[PDB]
Structures are given as C-alpha cells and as structure tokens.
C-alpha cells in the first residue's frame, strides 16, 4: 500500500549500489500510470537470485529456480526476479541478460513496462498508449504469447473486467484460434482466474468475452458458464459465482467438480443449493445450516430476510448445548448402546430447538420415560 512502492525504490537503490540493473516492472507500473495503488510491486534485476540474497538481511527463497527472491524489508515483501523468459510444456525458465529480452515475452503490453528509480518509463511495446486507450493487447505476436502459456488467454478475459478494458481485436481473434490449448492448463490455475473474474467489476463483460473468445467451448464444463449473469452481484466471495452458476441452470455441484474445490467450498455450495430447493425454512433449518449457507441461499433466490437474528434467537445454537447425551438415554432406557441413540437424541434435539421441550436433563428425562416406555 503506502509503503510497497517506497520499499521497492529502496530495493532498487540497494541493487544498483551493488552495480546491478533494477526496475519496477509489470502490474505496479500499470497501476501507477492508472492512478491506483499497487497490490504487488515486482522488481526486475540483472542480479541473479543468490546475489540478491547477499544484499538483503531477510529473503524468502521459494521461487529461486524460477529466478525470484522475495525481499523482506520495512515490513513489506518485494519480489525480485532476474531477467528471464519462461515457457510452459503441454505437460522451463531461461535467464536472459537484458531487460528487453525479458519484457518482450510478457503477456500484455500494459504489463510489459518498466520504470526506473527516477520515474522514467521503459515502454518498448506501446503499453502507455494501450493503457490510455484501455486495450489489452498481447506483446508481439499473440499466437506466440498464447502458445507459450495458454493460461494467458483466460488472463486476458480476467484483465478486461478487472480494468474495464477491451481486448485488442487481433489478440481476441488469436485467442479464438488457440482456445483449444486451454486443455493443457492445470485446473487449479483455471479456477484461480475464474475466482478473480467472479469477484471483479464488470464481470458480465468478462463472461461475454469468455464465450466470445471460444474459451467456454473448451474449458472444463465450459458451456455451464453461459448463463445470464445480469442478476449476479458479487458478495466478495468467489464461491457465490459458482453457486449462482449452478442455481441458474438447476444443476448440482457434481457438474463442476472438475475444478477441484476444497472440502469447505464444496460444502458451502451443496448446502446452499439444498437450501434453495427447500420450500419452507423453519427453526430446524436455521439451526442445522450455517449462517453463511443461509445467507448465500437467500442471495441467489433474491430474499432479504434478517437471517442472523432468526438464528440468534433459537433456544440453542448447537448440539454442544444439549442437556442430554446418549449415555443418559442408556441409563434411562436400560437398553444397550446402539444406533437407536442417534434417532432419539435427534427427536429430543428437535423438541428443544422448536422450544417445546425445555433444555433441562430432568425435564428431558420425564419426556423420554413417557415416550420410550
């Protein structure tokens, strides 16, 4: 935020005092020229990774093989990457000696700018003009950029909504010709880009481009993204886009399971879908489902109830508060432990959640001894 750019300027100054070239590069330059505050600030340098580690007290060496060292300084983290090009196999990183060799194989012209310590902008590919005209355009030959990393095709879509830009005609036609190549991309990278689209502004533009680019033809279950997105308003959670997608089509979670959801995200989607299929919600509904599930289900169905208050006013919040357990029932019934205990604990739990039976051991005992015997 208010400290990342300053810290990167310090990093650059330190790299240059050791005789290396260093520049701000990529998204930070784009954001600076748009008048936004960069979320990430990357530095490109002639220094190799181990030479960066010599110059800074605290570094994180995860991306070393790819040329990247994270520098920890003044409470920020600045990625320092040696000049490099990378290529993706259908199943490779090459360090280079000049900045321009690095820049000419980046994805889009607005991401292929560098800025010096003295605020001079190095813009070999017209990023400044494309930024002013709000155009996402591939650097150089779009066919080549997309053959290098087919995920860039979907990233163009994501950028169009993130920035409210159009996609350059030649670039878009190239995506259409190469959309088949999306099949080689790990579904985790695909899901990460789609999650961004779902929470970004102008997502209806992004979704139209997704279909227009032919990507929906070849994405995993890609045709499912061609719903009417007019009613969609993000709540800041990408999961709500996937739920909105399924709800519009009356489809179930299994239809999108190729994207490898976490067990938590899968549960939120399924339990929310179950809620949208329930005709009436009562105290049991608010007791058994989480508030996040009730809220997401209400959002896709357009309701605007005060869900938190209904849940808050139930007699109890969870099984933890129940005043009896299966061992009480074993005592009172004189029967051996078995699956029957779950049936009868739930009977008692329902009577308590509906406020019929008091949550009190002796009163539950009185009720149980009457109903069981």
Numbering used by the authors: -3 to 87, 93 to 373, 378
Relevant lines from the article:
A highly specialized RNA polymerase with an outstanding accuracy is the CCA–adding enzyme (tRNA nucleotidyltransferase) that adds and maintains the triplet sequence C-C-A at the 3′–end of tRNAs. Recently, we could show that the CCA-adding enzyme from Planococcus halocryophilus (PhaCCA), a bacterium from the arctic permafrost growing at –15 °C, is such a cold-adapted enzyme and catalyzes CCA-addition in vitro down to 0 °C. Interestingly, both the N–terminal catalytic core as well as the C-terminal tRNA–binding region are adapted to the cold, indicating that the psychrophilic features are not restricted to a single protein domain, but are distributed over the whole enzyme. Our results reveal that a combination of individual strategies – a global flexibility in the tRNA-binding C-terminus as well as a thermal adaptation in the highly conserved catalytic core motif C controlling interdomain movements during CCA-addition – contribute to the remarkable cold adaptation of this unusual RNA polymerase. The crystal structures reveal a globally conserved scaffold with local adaptations to provide the structural plasticity compatible with catalysis at low temperature.
In order to investigate the structural properties of PhaCCA leading to cold adaptation, crystals of the corresponding recombinant enzyme were grown. The crystallized construct consisted of the P. halocryophilus wild type sequence (377 amino acids) with an N–terminal extension of 43 residues including a 6xHis affinity tag. First crystals of PhaCCA were obtained in the presence of ammonium sulfate as crystallant and diffracted to a maximum resolution of 2.8 Å. They were used as seeds to screen for new conditions and led to crystals with similar cell parameters and symmetry but showing significantly improved diffraction properties (extending to a resolution of 1.8 Å) in the presence of PEG 3350 or diammonium hydrogen phosphate. All crystals showed a high solvent content (67%) with one enzyme monomer in the asymmetric unit. The refined structures are very similar, showing a root mean-square deviation (rmsd) ranging from 0.16 to 0.22 Å (for 370 superimposed Cα positions) when compared to the reference apo structure solved at the highest resolution. Their N–terminal extension is disordered and the first visible residue varied from position −4 to −2 at the end of the extension. The four C-terminal residues (HSHT) are also disordered, as well as the central part of the flexible loop (residues 82–93) in the head domain, except for the complex with CTP where it is clearly visible. PhaCCA is unambiguously monomeric in its crystalline state as well as in solution, as shown by SEC and SAXS analyses.
